[PDB]
Design a protein around this nucleic acid. Structure first.
Lengths: 79, 200, 103
DNA sequence: GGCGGCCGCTCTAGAACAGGATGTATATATCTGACACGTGCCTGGAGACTAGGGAGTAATCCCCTTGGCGGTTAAAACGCGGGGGACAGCGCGTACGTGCGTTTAAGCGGTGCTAGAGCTGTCTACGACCAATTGAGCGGCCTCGGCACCGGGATTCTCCAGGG
DNA sequence: TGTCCCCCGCGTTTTAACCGCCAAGGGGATTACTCCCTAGTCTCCAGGCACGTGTCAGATATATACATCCTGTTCTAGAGCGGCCGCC
């Protein structure tokens, strides 16, 4: 698996900014948003990996993702 | 192929480009490009050659002779160009022309007939010869028939006709090898008439 | 290895952007596609530990959490853009928002 | 003899550079006030023991995510037209930087007094735990209806063109 | 105030997304046998805490001294002006 950071497409980031009420979207916001999302995923998925390794499980459940989001003050409901 | 090929105003065709799909039309009419109608009328007015010396004595003899006699005195002349034109396909085409298609002789003979059909009134018309043609058209208008000059005109003026075609040949935009072929079959014509001195 | 190698509509910018803002702000469905985000998640996870799997619901929760976080970040970025007398966002506004947030 | 072109001369200003100014960086002198060593305890962890219970491990099982396809229409992406806005630039100004006069309370040190938090008993209900029990929460099945989907139609707000 | 180049609206053609469908096989979930070390005491003792105190580095103090910033004076480059010279 290589070049998967480009899976988050440019109109996907455009629609995400449209949900946030952004009037105009620059052409350099896409790489920065991809980097921010990569950093956030590299934190949350790593925390979920530690949670799964603690429980002697080989696949990561949604509850561990919920715990990893909750421990950083970003708690998620519905899972 | 290419980048600009449209029967209507071009829009980098390689269908109305830059428009929705509900505007197509493929009916058949006349087509004109006009460079997108002069670029939509400058954007709505900014938002609002001679014959060889072989038998050249004939026109010298006949230049003085047509001043008072005009080489003909009988209006229903017995000499017609039809038989002498028909004999070209049986005498010289079967002998001198290289084996193949005789189009270069027959098509030219038909074109000469078509030219002689309407060459009257504009050229080859001496003053009393013009009066004779006027009286021929007067006597031919009593039965509302077209004037057909194949039976009332001799072949003596054909030599003068092939003498006076080359300077009006170059009067129009024309390639030089066509004139070369013209003078080549003129040379063939004078070769054929070099020894056939009785009819001319 | 062995190889040698009539007039169009012409909507002005901003109005359709506000139309999309109104359409997606009242909307509910997920903007980011499923499999590209899942493949990015697997590619990120393979750097930490190999032979790892994610369930569908875990990928769903990660996608919704990331979408909400990025929507909040874009809201802060747009607020900084209007705060800077602008309507176009810049990556330096995103960096400033991340610095203020402490992350 | 008049005039354009050329070069020298003086005027003007940007800027490198040196000197004065004032708030800090240091060099002792000495206070000083907690810092860490010593002492005396003494109060909490360690050796050792009793007992047991929740996970390590094995087995099953069934479940659920990954790979892996065509299909198809939603959409990413390339590109043309163009359009409104980020920013360089310039000008207006005012309002906030700098500096002391003057006032004014912050803080150091002192004294009195009680508001009340530990501290020690005391006595007392209260919740974990053990028999004994029991009743609707939940997995699952039957039913059912609210809004996704599909169009049909429509008001309804928005852009383009004409007139003053 | 301008501008221009950066982004947006839309035409068009690829492009991979999602549902449709099928097995798989590691892997979550459950049940049971067993076993070590953790719950809970007994005793004590050696490391941890309260108190006392010599002390050694930090702060106050001040002439001396940095130290860079602000500003005055001069140096040198640039544009403007005027005198001189050659040509028509």
């Amino acid at each position: 698996l290589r070049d998967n950071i480009q899976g988050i497409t440019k109109p996907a980031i455009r629609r995400l900014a449209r949900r946030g009420g952004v009037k105009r979207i620059s052409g350099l916001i896409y790489e920065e948003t991809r980097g921010v999302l990569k950093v956030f995923l590299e934190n949350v998925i790593r925390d979920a990996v530690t949670y799964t390794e603690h429980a002697k499980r080989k696949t990561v459940t949604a509850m561990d993702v919920v715990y990893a989001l909750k421990r950083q003050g970003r708690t998620l409901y519905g899972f | 192929g290419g980048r600009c090929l449209a029967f209507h105003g071009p829009l980098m065709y390689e269908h109305y480009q830059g428009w929705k799909s509900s505007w197509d039309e493929w009916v058949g009419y006349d087509r004109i490009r006009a460079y997108n109608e002069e670029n939509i009328a400058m954007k709505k007015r900014l938002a609002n050659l001679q014959i060889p010396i072989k038998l050249k004595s004939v026109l010298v003899d006949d230049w003085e002779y047509v001043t008072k006699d005009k080489k003909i005195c009988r209006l229903p002349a017995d000499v017609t160009v039809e038989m002498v034109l028909n004999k070209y396909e049986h005498e010289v085409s079967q002998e001198l022309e290289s084996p193949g298609s005789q189009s270069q002789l027959s098509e030219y003979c038909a074109g000469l007939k078509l030219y002689f059909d309407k060459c009257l009134g504009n050229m080859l018309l001496y003053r009393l010869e013009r009066l004779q043609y006027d009286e021929l058209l007067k006597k031919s208008s009593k039965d509302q028939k077209p004037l057909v000059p194949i039976r009332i005109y001799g072949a003596i003026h054909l030599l003068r006709l092939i003498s006076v075609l080359p300077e009006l040949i170059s009067s129009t935009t024309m390639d030089l090898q066509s004139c070369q072929l013209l003078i080549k079959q003129t040379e063939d014509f004078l070769v054929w008439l070099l020894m056939h001195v009785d009819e001319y | 290895r062995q190889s040698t190698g009539k007039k169009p509509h012409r909507y002005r910018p901003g109005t359709v952007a506000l139309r999309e803002i109104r359409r997606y702000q009242k909307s509910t469905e997920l903007l980011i596609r499923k499999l590209p985000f899942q493949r990015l998640v697997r590619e990120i996870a393979q750097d930490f530990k190999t032979d790892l799997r994610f369930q569908s619901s875990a990928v769903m929760a990660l996608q919704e959490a990331s979408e909400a976080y990025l929507v909040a970040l874009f809201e802060d970025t747009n607020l900084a853009a209007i705060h800077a007398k602008r309507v176009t966002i810049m990556p330096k506004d995103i960096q400033l928002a991340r610095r203020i947030r402490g992350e």
